[PDB]
């Protein structure tokens, strides 16, 4: 349930012991998770 938008990394943070859902944009293409963009895929885009 963490992945909701492929541009936006989502998480839970604690401020004053409230669970605080948190959206934060993945800016660069590599900051997408490696099961969602494997390293051979980055090498293939690099060879492009």
């Amino acid at each position: 349930p963490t992945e909701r938008h492929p541009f936006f990394d989502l998480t839970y943070i604690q401020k004053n012991r409230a669970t605080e859902v948190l959206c934060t944009p993945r800016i660069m293409i590599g900051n997408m998770p490696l099961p969602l963009a494997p390293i051979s895929f980055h090498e293939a885009r690099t060879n492009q």
Binding site: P38, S40, F41, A44, R45, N47, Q48
Partner: protein
Amino acid sequence: FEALLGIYCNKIEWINFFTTPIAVAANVIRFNDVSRMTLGKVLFFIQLPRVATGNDVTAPKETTIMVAKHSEKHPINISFDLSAACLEHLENTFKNTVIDQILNINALHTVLRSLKNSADSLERGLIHAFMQTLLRKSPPQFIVLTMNENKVHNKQALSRVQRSNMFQSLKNRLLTSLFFLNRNNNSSYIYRILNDMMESVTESILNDTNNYTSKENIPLDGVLLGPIGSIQKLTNILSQYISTQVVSAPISYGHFIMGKENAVTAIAYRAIMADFTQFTVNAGTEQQDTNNKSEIFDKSRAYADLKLNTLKLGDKLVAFDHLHKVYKNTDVNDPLEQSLQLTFFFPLGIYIPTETGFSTMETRVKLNDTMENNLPTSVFFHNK
């Protein structure tokens, strides 16, 4: 000189309701108060027969089931105008002048032919509204076949394994038996699937001896009706089994009148018991639960004879025709011509993992080594 030749006019053919073979599906009975009827309903009483259980098995109890079927209702209308000048020339002559005589006779023929055209239009609207209701009712063939295959035990309504396999069977029946006349050519196979339709469809309630009866008392059983583009191919592939025979068919509508009993109960209790006088006089006697004829459904009407294109499907004589002769020149479409909407999906840019990558069909194609050829970026496919 400019010579103008003879004026040729059209003759519109006349559509009796009981000439078209939709009237074997129909059973039409005049009743002059459905403008005030709220809900017509028929009430059916089914008691189920059970099997005797073996030793030390809990016997299922005697099961009594009632189902009530309601009435939909649907109006039709026809409007036609008369112009003010035609209405002036209709009724009187101002003087005995020749042009007044000619336009008087023309306006009289205009009014008479317009009334004839409106009566024909009400008959064809009855055809179209009943065909509308049949297509609103009728579920498709793959659903009907899958529901005939899947039945239930007493214990619980359609277990999850049953309905999941039912869904997968719906997938399979849809993807095989979709485009029916076009894929195969086997008269054996196509006759088999029409046999599957006629065994899948359940039978009606009323068994009249004379409603659509052939010679020597064999009743015709249903109608198969399509458009003419289907039925030309169907005759060309099933000409062995198609005949034409004379069937004793009704010609007039049934007719029902209230009594003072029914009108009084309609005033007092907002309701009508049909078959009320038989329902009254069979009360104190022994024959309570038996009653023979339903006056609202079985009523004496005039009979005639006519020809029908029939088929023989395992000792089943079925009328078989197209309604194009009543949708020859009509603003509404033949409603058997219907549209599908199939949804398609396809990818682009899916990176197959190089780490577990392979290729079959190596001998067929061979790429030129470029990373635009080694990564999919676009997707190619054919149009219509």
